[PDB]
From Swiss-Prot, chains A, B, C, D, E, F:
This is Inorganic pyrophosphatase. It comes from Escherichia coli (strain K12). Substrate binds at residues 29, 43, 55, 139. Homohexamer. It comes from the Bacteria. Keywords: Cytoplasm, Hydrolase, Magnesium, Metal-binding.
Length: 168, 168, 168, 168, 168, 168
């Protein structure tokens, strides 16, 4: 099941992300249930907003909010909820609800050459970055959250390493 | 797997429904296979009709037609086949092929406040109810079924309780 | 999980195909991971082409390319990745990358009567056959493959039988 | 505008159909407004049914129900409301609300070779024909109509010729 | 063309709205060009938000922002850009960029009985109203606007009457 | 109607393109009819390929193939057939069926800042360029065409200027 997916081939450089919400989909927030590995409807979002990238998590990690590290993964076409994609981290958007750090990872080079030039957080389209920051600032307006800024691939991997160790 | 999803948090008030067919989808009838927990194509519907709500079942229950209790769940956007949604029962549409009772359950308040006012069968939109009755009367016209009417949340829960006990 | 789906009810006549890519979908190539049974993003296709039929494989078989036998299944509406469909084989498109034989199987009569007349490879629409041949010739142009022709239902089943034995 | 589209290149053999409702779409009934040529929302259908083929009319014709001759056109993919397709008639489904005759026309050979073998009403898939008959019998159940049967391409063209003359 | 659509059958009670952006669509802002009546891509929205209802305008009206009165129309399924829907006004959301008043109108009873009970601004779902207010407050965050509140059907019609007179 | 759309605001730098086929759509080839301005189904494509960008033409131009200059326009989301988008040219893919030159134009800066950095043909993603070249080489394989290469924005505008003059 999804409960058995590795954290990655070569942490923190090569990770696997379990997808819960596809890019641009209807406002249904799903989550993988730790008990059955099944896709559960977590909530219907109240705002008229959509996730700008595919949203998921790295299995076998645990951050301080007691949840697995969340990653946002841009792809050329929306992915299937419950699917797994191999990626490499490039940045982290730090915020506070606690501390939520949503990493941004791009598809691994073996899946597509389209993201090869993206190696660090400032290599990502500025508009993509404002749109992601804006979504997190505002998605729970009708349900608090504060963006504090972006950080590089080094910080992202530090976050992966720490959460993985913390999961052990 | 889906075979391990509970019948609910607090039967018969708080149940989980395993989704097989989303609201408004192409006429493909899927079912979860009791052996693998995998989604199987049960049949291609012959009529040009679509399910008016998401269609699924409560795991760990058994009705007299030797099948799990079937539930119809209205949501603001179509759900994913194989996903699970927490709901609360509000009615039952009784019919006969045997006795099929398709319950109607609405999303649990923790998932969305939109259905909070819906507490009993007459709180559901009349048009939604005619449309559901009409679908069951006519979906197998080219494949018999007879609608006998609606019943309240009390009857629905009685149906859940009985089928759950019968499953044990 | 999907890892536990049988090869079929009555090999080679009655098989089950595990679906990875739906007909007419975005160019994302998925595959079921032998380790978790989870849907993995195998690759993003580079060409502006879509699979003309649903694409999948027969579990518990092994061909010479060290992979499970791949099948293409036409249906009236696109299927869900990860779902299973009961079919009956009718042909094989032989090619070479090694030897890849992609079988063509149509939905089993119990799922729909629409494909009952299709019993052998020449009963399939000519346009459907050219379109499939054309897709395989050209889908990896930007990533080699050569079509050698079609073969009947007898050859297809021989291929199923052999790969199943080889899997044992 | 759409008000200026010819009835056809070579009536009754070669006609143009103005599309109002695509095959398999949401239950919104549109119609082209004789005054502006604009697409107007005529009604929201109450039943959970979808048109099995693209639905439209032949401009410059007038039947007895004081409306333009309506045609159903099967295509491999849904068409755009307001678009025009060149076709050739092959049958008519006679009914009564008055007399409604919905013709069935298939795409002209110059647009695609896929329908070339379809020359008369019995050349159409039986399932397609039952599904169309069933839709008309039941689409207004919640809004009367009675199917009386099918007729050949000769009757269809007679219907086109008469309505065109009647329009003059 | 769309330039010739009336403002309504019985202003301000019975109006026609020309649709530019469907409910829940990709973030493309279209507008009807006063010169050709053609649908022009006005802008690609920068925020990850979607219009919660169909968005359009009443032809033959002119407000103070030198633009036609804009209306938001909830329907059970998304409409086609460029289509026209008969409605009746029920409220207005007043704001300021100038003065923008976006009316809310529901489908006319002749198109569907589903909105008959909605007669005034407080009859609209509270969540629908917060979602609309929230969208306008935030849709141009990356491109200013301030919501001042809702008003009744009387104010809405006053707005229609005034803008129509102003258009003459 | 669409027949009245200008060639552009400031030819050859600022043009308007009339869209016939959206990016990534079903294989239906539409064209705007010079007589009514209506969208006509030109043909159903036989290959399992989709246009990689929105496809259209510049009104009021005439190339040597006796047809209006065709343009391919990448956008973040698919456009509506029949809509108009303001763009600026950046390249031309020269080929031969005669001489077909399909220009590539990107959305005008006033519609979105996302394409501002794209000023010449080599500023376009290499993969986007191979995919477009590949599509034209192969889309009519089952219906000839030969790609000869790309050219800069200067050549593109020369092509626009010449065809516009030729249209006068």
């Amino acid at each position: 099941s999804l409960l058995n997916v590795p954290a990655g081939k070569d942490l923190p450089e090569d990770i696997y992300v379990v997808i819960e919400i596809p890019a641009n989909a209807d406002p249904i927030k799903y989550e993988i249930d730790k008990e059955s590995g099944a896709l559960f409807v977590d909530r219907f979002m109240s705002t008229a907003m959509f996730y700008p990238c595919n949203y998921g998590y790295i299995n076998h990690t645990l951050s301080l909010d007691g949840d697995p590290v969340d990653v946002l993964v841009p792809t050329p076409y929306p992915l299937q909820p419950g699917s797994v994609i191999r990626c490499r981290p490039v940045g982290v958007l730090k915020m506070t609800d606690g501390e939520d750090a949503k990493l941004v990872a791009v598809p691994h080079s073996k899946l597509s050459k389209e993201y090869d030039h993206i190696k660090d957080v400032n290599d990502l389209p500025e508009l993509l970055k404002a749109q992601i920051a804006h979504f997190f600032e505002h998605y729970k307006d009708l349900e608090w959250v504060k963006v504090e800024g972006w950080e590089n691939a080094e910080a992202a991997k530090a976050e992966i390493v720490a959460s993985f160790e913390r999961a052990k």
